[PDB]
């Protein structure tokens, strides 16, 4: 199934910086564009690519952390949900 979401302003800015062109998204779309953003800006550690450094990026201002691990599935979703409204 799908869950529809409306990003808050900073998330919306990020999404649009990587090609997104709308106000309402599916969660699958949000997660795609965030992955695209991180990959495009090479925010991850070159050697241990589960580690994302974002203290000097907009993503750090969005998530409110200097870094995180891609393996923290719960915390990533929590940090994304804080920046959107469901439906």
């Amino acid at each position: 199934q799908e869950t529809l979401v409306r990003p808050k302003p900073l998330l919306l800015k990020l999404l649009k910086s990587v090609g997104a062109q709308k106000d309402t998204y599916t969660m699958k779309e949000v997660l795609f564009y965030l992955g695209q953003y991180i990959m495009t800006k090479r925010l991850y550690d070159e050697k241990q690519q589960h580690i994302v450094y974002c203290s000097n990026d907009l993503l750090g201002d969005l998530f409110g952390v200097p870094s995180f691990s891609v393996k923290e599935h719960r915390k990533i979703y929590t940090m994304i949900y804080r920046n959107l409204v469901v439906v």
Binding site: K28, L31, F32, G35, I38, M39, Y44, Q49, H50, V52, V70, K71, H73, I76
Partner: peptide, 13 residues
């Protein structure tokens, strides 16, 4: 592993 595959594993719950 590549960031690409790790994030896909994330998306692919």
């Amino acid at each position: 592993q590549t960031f690409x595959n790790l994030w896909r594993l994330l998306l692919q719950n």
